[PDB]
């Protein structure tokens, strides 16, 4: 009999697109039991044998981890037992979809299984979820001989999906254990500390309702925003003085000159410089220079940069941007948007990707010229060995794509074209003026070739009126000498972009989990989003961070969180032990938990004052 | 020349810019019979100029009426700050300093600014350090204008220096 091969993707839409590619359009589709998921069937060849292919999908994570029974209630103390004593089991992430039964059913007469789940670690974790359901019901293996395979791919394109099939590998079980470990750590510590506080504060304060929570990652994230707040509140502005002079050119222009000394913080010394310059009527050219310098094209686009730009420029929250990008990836418009890599592999077909955009009105002429002239090599970046940079894989118009989806897509495409374009070359000109004893300079930039700044106009060199041409020894009439009195300014609240950078620097929120944590502290109302996507700490958010710090600074500082995640990654590489990392970490936090509870007074007092 | 030798020592000192009182000079000798200007200078460098120095500066040097100072003269540094740059931030790069120095001859205090870049001094220069001014120093609005050409660091240290006794 003809063998049947089951293939499983992460989402219904992914399964359909992949199947269209592999079947060369020879597809037969029928509805699954749940209505949401479809089944795609066709005949083909596998391992030099005629087989039936059966492609379907799940709907994201099949399971979520929860306790078995009674530990699920909030009123049920002791919360401290959730660290070591409480047993764990996998529960269906969405019971209404009845995902487990469906997998068992389609998986029962199948002989081989090929995993087509997304190739970040999350997709890999679901692989063994899928295998756990399907493996016990599969056809027995004679040798046994390999019957389980795993496809690796970074984009939903004909080239990448077909190539994946030709070189199938295996699922990484070491890496899989790390996700389980990550799930267990955040839940236990999170629920223990949270449920404790919800009861402790239950009905305690009139202005206090269930909004209180703690998280091993979400709390250090909030810590950053509150840290910025504290520096802002204690900032003390200082008055300083800047001397500036104006000179009239031969073309009747007001040239503004910059003080070489830039600024001064002494009132009397400020007056001194002004007195010795205010009566001077002539400014003498002491030096001139022209230097050709280059403003480099950007590094290849990474996940962190996408979220920052989406926030700063497109007004999209980190979570909002991620879901938009994943949908774009789903529809095959971009490569997988979860990668830390900023370096194109030598093998990567840059020209292939570039041709799809050669017909869009906004950048058609730029792309066409580059394919004839020949593409430039992208700057060498860092190769993390996970995926390529986020690159467009298919053409689109503003007609096909919706509001938010188009705006994000437009940037990703424009960014890519710049990385493969030429650098921007410009002239940096300067003139040095002497007024009395004091030195002044004026600077100006003139664009020679726009380069990538043509397709990225927001990074363009600002248009300035050309500097008057002159020689050493020339003199210009001083039109005005005034001294401006100003005050140094305090920092503003953290932008979403600044928070992302902070998290990246300190090594927390890895594997693209950064947008999840940021969205978390907003939903829990620990910060508010103000104009310019600024993160303003709420009353509750401030007290909590201050409270945590007084008891144990290590609860807020990213130091501890950074090390656990580094340990988890070592597990993933097989250079550390799953059980040993769990045991050591849980011991550390159980000790910290008991100390926290004892020193709870540190938190209660601030709550009384505020509420 | 029983103490005539002590007199000529004072004259040699002033030619070098050191303005010490007669009592201060005796204090820096090791014997009354064998005055050595070299030993006196060495000791004075490590002594508070308010203790052994004699006033040379005009009483009104800070008022602005005085526009020039003629060297040579040895002074003591009382305090240094970045006057170009803000108090809390201090050092960070996009400023040029621009140091302000409060100085004294032991009797009159004055204020100097680093008009041109003096690599020989920094924010970390210890209070009590002595400097020799030479040539003509311009004084604008009461501030001495110092540069590499008119200022020489002589060294010396004074521990636990109190700005105002
Ligand atoms: Mg996923």
Numbering used by the authors:
A (entry chain A): 0 to 208, 210 to 611
B (entry chain B): -3 to 161
What does the paper say about this structure?
Overall, the TOP3β–TDRD3 structure is similar to the TOP3α–RMI1 structure. Binding of TDRD3 did not affect the spatial arrangement of domains I, III and IV. The interaction between TOP3β and TDRD3 occurs between domain II of TOP3β and the OB-fold domain of TDRD3, consistent with our finding that the TDRD3 OB-fold domain is sufficient for binding to TOP3β. The core-mediated interaction is primarily hydrophobic: Val109, Phe111, Phe139 and Leu141 of TDRD3 and Ile269, Met272, Phe273, Met276 and Pro437 of TOP3β engage in this hydrophobic interaction. In addition, a hydrogen bond is formed between TDRD3 Arg96 and TOP3β Asp266. The insertion loop of TDRD3 interacts with the loop connecting β10 and α7 of TOP3β. In the N-terminal region of the insertion loop, Val79, Ala80, Ala81 and Pro82 of TDRD3 form a hydrophobic surface to interact with Val264, Phe265 and Ile269 of TOP3β. Furthermore, in the C-terminal region of the insertion loop, Ala90, Ala91, Pro92 and Met94 of TDRD3 also form a hydrophobic surface to interact with Val262, Val264, Ile269 and Phe273 of TOP3β. TDRD3 does not slow down the DNA relaxation activity of TOP3β32 but rather enhances it, in agreement with the short insertion loop of TDRD3, which is located far from the catalytic center composed of domains I, III and IV in the TOP3β–TDRD3 complex.
